[PDB]
Structures are given as C-alpha cells and as structure tokens.
Design a protein around this nucleic acid. Structure first.
Lengths: 126, 53, 182, 136, 64, 79
RNA sequence: GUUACGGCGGUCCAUAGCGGCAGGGAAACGCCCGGUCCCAUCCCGAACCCGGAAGCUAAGCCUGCCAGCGCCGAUGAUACUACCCAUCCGGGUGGAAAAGUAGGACACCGCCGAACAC
RNA sequence: GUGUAAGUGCACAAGGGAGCUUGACUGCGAGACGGACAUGUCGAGCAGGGACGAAAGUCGGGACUAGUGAUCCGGCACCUCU
C-alpha cells in the first residue's frame, strides 16, 4: 500500500513543453503554400512534419526512426542533418518552397538548429 | 502648463552634422549626459544626437 | 573516475538495507536524497546592510559556491522591511558536492557542537524532509573562525524522495545522521 | 435594536414594492408563523415592539425567530429646508416585505397562547397579515 | 558552476588526530581552506588537514 | 451645506458597430472597447486602445475560440 | 486494413475535469548514466544543452472500470414582459426564463507516422 | 498583482525576471468610428534608414481610457522662398 506524494519531473517537463509550444503558436500560422515546420524531439530520435493549420492537415513528414536514416553513423546531430535533407527533398517534391520554423516548444541550438541550418543550406526559405 | 523648474525638466536634442532637433521631456535628479542617443536626420541617416539644451 | 564516501556507501549498503526493510516492487521506488538547502536570514537588513556580505563570504568559504541573495517580495513595515531589501542568502547543493558537504558536516562540525545529545527525529514534514538549524557558524573548520564579527546562524533542510517519515528516518539513519535513537 | 454594523453604500434608493415573494414563503424553524399579504417597509422599532409584545405574552419560555433584518436605509433630510441641495442622511432602516413573506416564527406549546401572541404582534405593524401553521 | 567564479576546488585528506581513523576525499576545500602535508592515501597525492576532533572521538549516539 | 458630488465624464461611444452578417470594407472598425471583451480571430486586427478592425474584407462571425468570444471575417463570394 | 502505440490539431471547449481500483511496455513515449564538445544557472549540468543506452514501467502516458467530488440538461408549469381589453382590481393572443426534476456523461472527430498484412 | 481613481481585461498572461537596446523615428496613408462646428480615436499597407531575433515577424511609446488650453502676437535653429 505504498503511495507517492506529487509531481515528477517528467510531468513537469511535458506540460511545460506544451505550455510554451502553445505559447509560441500564437504567432506562427499555417497554409498550404506557407506551412508550419513542426519538430517533435526525444532524447533518442526526432520527428518533423509540415502542417497546414487551416485544416489541421499534413503534407510532409520525416523522422530519425527510418532505417534509411539510421544508416547514418555519425552523431545525433548528423542524424538530424540527414533528416533535414530528406524533408527538404520531400517538401520540394510535394510543392513547398517557403515555410516557417516552429521549434515545437524546444530551445533553438544543438540538434534543432543544426537540422534547420542544414535545411536553409539545402534550399528551404527560412 | 507653466515654466517652473519641474522635476520633469529639460528639452532640446541637437545633432552632430545633423540639424534636426528632436525633443523629449525628462527628469534631472539622475546622473548622465554624455552617452546614448540616436535618430534619423535630414538628408542623412540613423546617427547620434546630443541632448543639448 | 572518482567516488565520494557517502555516495559509494549509498549505492553499496543503504539501498540494499531499505530493500530488505520495505520490500518495494520496483527499485525506482527506493528513497534517494536529491538536494541540500542552506539559508541565512540576516534580519537586520534595515540596520546592517553589510552583514549580508559577511554571510555571503561565510557561506562561500563553507560551501564552495557563491550564494543567492533572496529579496523581499512583500513590504511589511513593522520590521522596516521594504520591497527588495536583502534579508537572507540561500544556496542549493546537488551531486558530489552535496555528498562531500554531508560528509564534512557529519564528520567535522556536528561532532563539534557543544553537548550534542541528538538531532530530533521530529524535524520531518509530510514524508521525511529534515529541517534543522544552527545558531552559530563557530564550528566549520572551513571557516576562518578568528575573523568573525558576530554570530550569523543558519538553517539547513534536507529533502528526499522518501514518501513517509519512517522511510526518511530509516534512510538518514543508514546514512549516519545522529538522530536521537528512541 | 437592529442595525447593521456597516453598509458599503449608506445612501440607497427606495426599495421596490412590486411583486410577490420568492423565499420565506414557508415556515422554517418554529411552529406558528406570521405571513404578510401586502407590500410595506418594516423598520427597526416595529420589530422591537413586536418581539417584546410576544415575550410579554408568553413570559417564561418558548422561542421567537425573526426572519427579517433592516438592511436597507432611508434618508430624511433636516427640517424646513427647501428641496434641492443634496440627499439627506440615513436615520432609520427598513426591510422590504413582499406578500407571501414570513416575518416571525414562534415555538410555544399551546396554540391558544401562541395564536394570541402573534395577534398582539400583528397589531403592532402596518400590514394586514395572517397566522400560519407549518402544515400544508 | 560558472564564471563569476566560486571558491576553488581541490581534494583533501582529513587526517584523524583522534585515533588514526582518517578520511580522504574530493572537495571544494583547497587553496581556499587546506593544510600542508600532501600525503598520498591512494594512487595520487593531495593536501592534508589535521582533524582535532571527529565522530570516533566524540562521545555521542554514534560514539560512547 | 454642499453636495461635493456632481461631476461626470462625457461618453466615449463604445460597443459593437458592425454586427453579424454585414459587409465591411478594410480597416473598418467593428468594435471599440477598453479591454479584450472580444478578441480577434482571423483576418482581424487589434488597435492601441483595444479597438478591433478588419484586415481583409468580407463579413462577420462572432464565434468563440476556447471560451472567449472572437470576431472573424470570412471570404465573400466574388460575383 | 488493425491493436491497450506515438505526434500535430479541431469542438461555438468540462458530455472532455478531479479523485479511487485494476492493468500495459515489441518498435516508439519515457524515466535514467555522466558533464569530454556547443550551450546554461540572478548559486546549483536541478532546469535548458550535450554525449549514451547498465537498469524499471514505480511515476508520466495510454486502456477498462466507479456517476463520488464537478459539469450538462430538457418537456410542462411559474415569475417577468410586448400588444389589447378593463372605472382602481385584474384579465386575453404571442414570447418565455432562473431554480428544480427526469436524466446524460469517465468524450467525440480529422491527418501523418509506426508496428502489423493480405 | 497590474506606477497613480474606477471599470473593462489580463494565467493563452498585459503579472515576475534576465540580455541586447532607442521605433519615446522620418515621408505618407486606403477605409472607418464618433460626429452641430472646431476639436478627438484607431488605422493595414508602401519607401528610406535601423533595433531585436536563427528566422517568421514585432517595434510610428507606456494593458486601455485622464494627465492639460484653441486663435492672435512675439522668441530660437535650419531652408537653394521673397
């Protein structure tokens, strides 16, 4: 009949993330010719989407789970870089050149920033 | 209102090589008068003024 | 490539003993100290704004980290207290530095208190967080005990992921706090 | 005497005398009650007179509840002053009383003495009223 | 931890002057607060501090 | 023997000015207001005095977005 | 297509919440190990950040259960009211609450991704 | 709690805190409110030249409404007007 007392930091970190993400989202918008680039991070891997918030739909996608992206050897950062490459290619196939960048409730720098900078290098306008 | 020596005092903000007096009303019980300041003059561009009364 | 005394001891014996006492399903339920807390209320902020610096220097010499200066968010004028008057210093301790601090405290100073019969088992709260207090800083050999101009006591409080006072007292016993065994 | 210890706004409009009761249309705490029928403003002194009328008619033991409190003032202004120049000061305190509303509730055993007492307290008030039993 | 420097951090050997049951461990106590005799108790050498009194020389719940 | 009261402040003509259904041009003023009783939605902007105005022509829709009454603008159908 | 999966969103935003019970960890969500490198604390690698996967589903989270703390909520009647009749009173045609009741409800919906498969 | 009265709003923070900093700019302004009249209020968007930010984007004073006084007559600086 052991019982806990209160908040774990997992809950804290989670709900704080959602808090600041839906803070940030006030200024970011969505559209099929200017969609939103959402990123959703974990310690291990990462996920990203291109979102149209006019209909809450999705146009592209990518993540560091796919074996073809695990075929990278280098750091987490390099996984993220190749992810940015894949999403640039896919976005510019499905017909999107310009986007915004939603950091999804995370700080800019590290894996997020290296992703985004690789994408800016490889053609996306932001 | 009047011209008393009010806490909110002083005026004139003149420009170097830029003659476009920009004005502002400020206090004078605080220390400073030889730093900061900036604005757009005539024919010129974003450059630095004095608070010169 | 290093281990403090109390932490090696913690990972060797104490976790085992608490397991054999309370029989948890997951070992994640095991109690573990998180942090250690230090505070000093100057209180004469409106009469000596310099004892604050004195206390800062003492806690610096004591804990090896520059403290935080806690401001007064409310203004209660029956004490002269006004919004922003520094009343006290505060320090947080976490990790190897914490374990070293507990080693020093248990092994140098608390065996230097005058007529130390025992720290109560009743400084806990809700689940086992031990909040005691020191009158003087005339005890840490860390301190230069020649230069002190006044007593500047302090207040310590020790927080743990323990869920009740029984587990708290048992853990702190295994770790070697001189409770009054009763 | 009945007054409040403090009101926020010590100069109020006159209460309304329009409509029937919403609450206090049901005896609550005693056995033998008083019920109004008209609209009226009932003051402090009236209720004092009435409770004394009741206690001097039972005289020993039996309880009296007053479901009203004068929490709305009225403003007289001093004498022989031309109209205008402000609003007078509060001097006496009323409670509004809409028809259907219950004022007093007695608890004394014998209905004879109780009904008589309530009648003596009715004849100290400006309103037509009647007497109530808790029953349907 | 960070610049706006703290006190300095070096090891320490608290030599039991009571009965010779000494201690030795990393600490934030050093130039700041240390004693001479760099006595290696281990594979390395680091400062020492005479311990006038301690646990095994202080009658109490842990000591008689 | 004085009434020290008597003052008052002239109006400010607040409230809604273009209700549901109407056709509004750009930059037109839907509501004047002190606080954000009504918040902006889509194709709507805020002022300095918490006035609202239109950013895109169309027609109104006073709907709510998470408990707060909004104002919106929708596309008219081109003739 | 599909399962007790994850993520982004919506509802004129609690019918969606809080609390209690049981139960799950394949890939994922996580917690955790440690501060070498970017980077950070009004002090603290606690947080943010970095590098990994020893350990555990205990907690977070997801699933079912409990209508209990909260919410939603009608029909009909009443109050009030527009108009009209009416010598005070009151009344007729239409509109119609709040509360209360019966009840409901341990949410619903959309997209991509996984895992699973013909 | 919001600098200062009250209200309307603010936890999605406009509350609290830290780093840079001067947009407390210049040239304009569609369409509108309110409207005896003069006054008064907001204003997207364009241009130079900038701040901040990784970018998107925000900045033409302050959470909003009060904080001041028409016209005439003179005063100071600048103008490629007489």
């Amino acid at each position: 009949a052991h019982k806990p007392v209160g908040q774990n930091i997992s809950e804290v970190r989670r709900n704080a993330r959602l808090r600041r993400h839906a803070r940030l989202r006030k200024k970011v918008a969505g559209t099929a010719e200017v969609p939103r680039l959402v990123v959703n991070r974990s310690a291990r891997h990462i996920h990203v989407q291109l979102v149209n918030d006019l209909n809450g739909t999705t146009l592209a996608a990518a993540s560091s789970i796919e074996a073809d992206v695990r075929a990278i050897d280098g750091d987490k950062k390099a996984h993220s870089v190749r992810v940015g490459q894949l999403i640039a290619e896919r976005a510019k196939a499905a017909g999107v050149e310009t986007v915004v960048f939603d950091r999804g409730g995370y700080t800019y720098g590290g894996r997020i920033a290296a992703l985004a900078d690789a994408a800016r290098e490889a053609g996306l306008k932001f | 209102a009047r011209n008393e020596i009010r806490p909110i005092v002083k005026l004139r903000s003149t420009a170097g090589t830029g003659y476009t007096y920009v004005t502002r009303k400020n206090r004078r019980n605080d220390p400073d008068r030889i730093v900061l300041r900036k604005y757009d003059p005539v024919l010129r561009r974003h450059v630095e003024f004095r608070e010169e009364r | 490539k290093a281990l403090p005394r109390l932490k090696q001891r913690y990972r060797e014996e104490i976790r085992e003993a608490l397991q054999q006492e309370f029989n948890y399903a997951n070992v994640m339920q095991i109690p573990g100290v998180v942090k250690v807390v230090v505070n000093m209320g100057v209180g004469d902020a409106a009469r000596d704004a310099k004892l604050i610096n004195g206390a800062i220097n003492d806690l610096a010499l004591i804990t090896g980290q520059k403290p935080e200066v806690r401001r007064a968010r409310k203004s209660i004028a029956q004490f002269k207290l006004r919004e922003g008057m520094p009343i006290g210093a505060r320090v947080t301790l976490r990790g190897d530095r914490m374990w070293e601090f507990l080693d020093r405290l248990i092994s140098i100073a608390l065996p230097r208190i005058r007529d130390f019969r025992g720290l109560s088992p009743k400084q806990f709260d809700g689940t086992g967080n031990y909040t005691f207090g020191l009158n003087e800083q005339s005890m840490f050999h860390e301190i230069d005990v020649d230069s002190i101009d006044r007593p500047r006591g302090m207040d310590i409080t020790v927080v743990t992921t323990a869920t009740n006072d029984a587990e708290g007292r048992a853990l702190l016993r295994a770790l070697g706090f001189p409770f009054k065994e009763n | 005497m009945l007054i409040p210890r403090k009101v926020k706004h010590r100069k109020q409009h006159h209460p309304e005398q329009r409509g029937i009761a919403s609450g206090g249309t049901s005896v609550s705490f005693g056995d033998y009650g008083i019920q109004a029928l008209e609209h009226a403003y009932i003051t402090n002194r009236q209720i004092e007179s009435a409770r004394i009328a009741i206690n001097r008619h039972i005289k020993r033991g039996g309880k009296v509840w007053i479901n009203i409190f004068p929490d709305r003032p009225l403003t007289k202004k001093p004498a022989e002053t031309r109209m205008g120049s402000g609003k007078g000061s509060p001097e006496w305190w009323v409670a509004n009383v809409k028809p259907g509303r219950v004022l007093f509730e007695l608890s004394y055993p014998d209905e004879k003495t109780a009904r008589d007492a309530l009648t003596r307290a009715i004849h100290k008030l400006p309103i037509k009223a009647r007497i109530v039993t808790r029953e349907e | 931890m960070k610049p706006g420097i703290h006190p300095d951090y070096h090891p320490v050997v608290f030599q039991d002057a009571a009965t010779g049951a000494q201690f030795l461990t990393r600490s934030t106590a050093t130039s700041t607060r240390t004693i001479e005799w760099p006595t290696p108790s281990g594979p390395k050498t680091y400062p020492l501090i005479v311990v006038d009194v301690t646990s095994d020389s202080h009658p109490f719940w842990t000591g008689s | 023997s004085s009434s020290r009261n008597g003052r008052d402040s002239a109006a400010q003509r607040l409230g809604v000015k273009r209700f549901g259904g109407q056709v509004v041009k750009a930059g037109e003023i839907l509501v004047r207001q002190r606080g954000t009783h009504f918040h902006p939605g889509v194709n709507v902007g805020r002022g300095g005095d918490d006035t609202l105005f239109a950013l895109a022509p169309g027609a109104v829709e006073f709907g709510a977005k998470r408990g707060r009454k909004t104002v919106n603008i929708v596309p008219v159908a081109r003739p």
